[PDB]
Structures are given as C-alpha cells and as structure tokens.
C-alpha cells in the first residue's frame, strides 16, 4: 500500500473547502507529481462520497493526451489522495487573468484540444459538467490538461439525461437552471463560456448575486465585440444557444457539429489528438520545483498537517502500473 510518507511535500498549488493540492516528490523515483489531498470528514459531511468514487473511477478508466493521468489513488484513515502527473504550465485562469484576452488563433488552439477531450469523454458515455478556466491546465509543452472529474456522470449515451443540479454557477447551462433533466450538451455550453472568455476577455454573464446571474444565463442575450470575427461570433452564438436542441454540438453527431464549424476550418482533427498542433505559448519552467505559473496566494503558504477502523472508501484505491 502507498502512504503519505512515500512523498516529499514541497509547495501548495491549490486550497479550498474539500482539501488541497500540493506539488510532491516521490521519494523512490525522485519524480514530481500533483497530489490532491481530500478530507474524508468533509466529503462525508457534505454527502459527496459518490462524486469522489466517480472521480477515481473516471481517472482510472480514461487515457487521452488532454486529460490528466492518475498515478496513484490511495487513502489514510481520514484522507483521500490522488497522485497525478504534474502540469507545470498552470491554469488557463492564471494565464487569461494575466493577459486579459487571447487572440482568436490562440483560443482556437485551446478550444480544439478541449473539443478533442470532450469528444473522447462523450464517446465513452461520460459527461464532464464542469468545463471552466480553473479546471483547464497546461502541461510543460503548453498542451491542455483537463483536471477535476468530481462532477462527472457515467453511463450517459445518446440522449440519456441527468438530474443533479451541479457545476459552477457562472458556467451553468440554461436548461440546468430549469426543472427536470438535461443532456450532455451542457458540456458544449461550457466550452462556449470558456471560448467566450478567451476571446472576449470576460464571462458572457456575470453578477455576484446568483439570483441575478441565473436570470442573465436564462434571459439575457449575449454580446460580442464589434471586431470579433464573423466565424468566432457564429461559434460562440452556436455554443451559447440557450436551447440545447438548437445548440452547436447538441445534435446526434455531438462533437462532429463543433469540429465541422467554420471557426475550426483550419484544423485537422486527427493532428489535434496526435499533439501535432504547435502550442502558441510554451511554459518557461527552469526546474521541476518551479511554480511560477501558480498564484503566490497558494505557493507562498507553509505546508502543514491537520490535527483531528472501517472508515475505508471502497472502490477508490489504484495504481497505474498494476492496472
């Protein structure tokens, strides 16, 4: 069994209510990884055990260039640990906040790699349901890596629906803000919101009051900068169609509709999956312990441990080499 003391704990990359993510070094190999450490006490209290099991199961059963890879899933008496390959390039949220806006060419690169990832998950009957800038990381080469599969739903084939009110408030599709069920097209709405942010430098709808936010998502008409290209306006308008039936990617062919849109005219999609598209930005990391593309808010904090049977989480533990 793998344990806490098999790793050195170097720098805090993320922190929140569920737990934290730390850059670690595996003592045996000397190799670096990102370890998401979640408190079982919190997961049980919030009644989110099913989501933690789903995340591990999706990570175990997925392999794609633009999805994060699980090395070890292990647990202690009160903690759940995901050991994952370290994306040194940081979040897309970090980079877009720094640069304010991307060019249409750079957004097209990131958009294509996300579409490739979403086609993969959808062909595997998985709906991701949490596309956003914080969940999109960059690897050392500058390629996209989707992280955090906690809100995934499995077994969702052509036209199957979901009931859980979940996601992130700012990225919720209009149909999720209505009663009853919704389809896998919510992922293409999410793609639309991130694409909108990359090219327009803001969320298409924002208010800190969720009441006002959800009214904007349901009722408000999106706007575009005058100088945005016609194909970019058409793509965003297609992805952000409030009716999922009339949304780009909402038809039976799914990602095909999005891939065949005139905005991606210049893209060969077999080259996308083959990592043959040239990244417009290459992370300037000097070492492996270099965390320049993460917030000082987190990386400046001193690493510490928390002072607090069959408290086991079944169907969680895993090794990439054993399976």
């Amino acid at each position: 069994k793998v344990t806490m003391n098999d790793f050195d704990y170097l720098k805090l990359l993320g922190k929140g209510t569920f737990g934290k993510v730390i850059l670690v070094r595996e003592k045996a190999t000397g190799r670096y990884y990102a370890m998401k450490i979640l408190r079982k006490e919190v997961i049980i209290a919030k009644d989110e055990v099913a989501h933690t099991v789903t995340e591990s199961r999706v990570l175990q059963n997925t392999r794609h260039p633009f999805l994060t890879a699980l090395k070890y899933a292990f647990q202690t008496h009160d903690r759940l640990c995901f050991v994952m390959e370290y994306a040194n390039g940081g979040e897309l949220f970090f980079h877009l906040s720094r640069e304010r806006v991307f060019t249409e060419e750079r957004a097209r690169f990131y958009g294509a790699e996300i579409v490739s990832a979403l086609e993969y998950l959808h062909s595997r009957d998985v709906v991701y349901r949490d596309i956003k800038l914080e969940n999109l990381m960059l690897d050392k080469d500058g390629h996209i890596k989707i992280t955090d599969f906690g809100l995934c739903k499995e077994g969702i084939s052509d036209g199957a629906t979901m009931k859980t009110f979940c996601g992130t408030p700012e990225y919720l599709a209009p149909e999720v803000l209505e009663d009853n069920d919704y389809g896998r097209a919510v992922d293409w709405w999410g793609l639309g919101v991130v694409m909108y942010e990359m090219m327009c430098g803001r969320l298409p709808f924002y208010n800190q009051d969720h009441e006002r936010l959800f009214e904007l998502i349901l009722m408000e008409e999106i706007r575009f900068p005058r100088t945005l290209s016609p194909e970019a306006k058409s793509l965003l308008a297609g992805l952000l169609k409030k009716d999922p039936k009339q949304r780009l990617g909402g038809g039976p062919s799914d990602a095909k509709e999005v891939m065949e849109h005139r905005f991606f005219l210049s893209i060969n999609w077999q080259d996308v999956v083959q990592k043959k598209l040239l990244p417009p930005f290459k992370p300037q990391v000097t070492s492996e312990v270099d965390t320049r593309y993460f917030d000082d808010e987190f990386t400046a904090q001193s690493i510490t441990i928390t002072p607090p049977q069959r408290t086991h989480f079944p169907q969680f533990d895993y090794s990439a080499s054993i399976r």
Binding site: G16, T17, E48, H51, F93, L96, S97, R100, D130, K132, E134, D148, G150, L151, T164, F165, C166, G167, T168, P169, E170, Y171, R202, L203, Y206
Partner: peptide, 10 residues
Amino acid sequence: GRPRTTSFAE
C-alpha cells in the same frame, strides 16, 4: 479579471 469560482453539487 473575475474572482475564482467554486464547484458545487445539489
């Protein structure tokens, strides 16, 4: 630059 968002469920 918007504030960090948080995921949620039910």
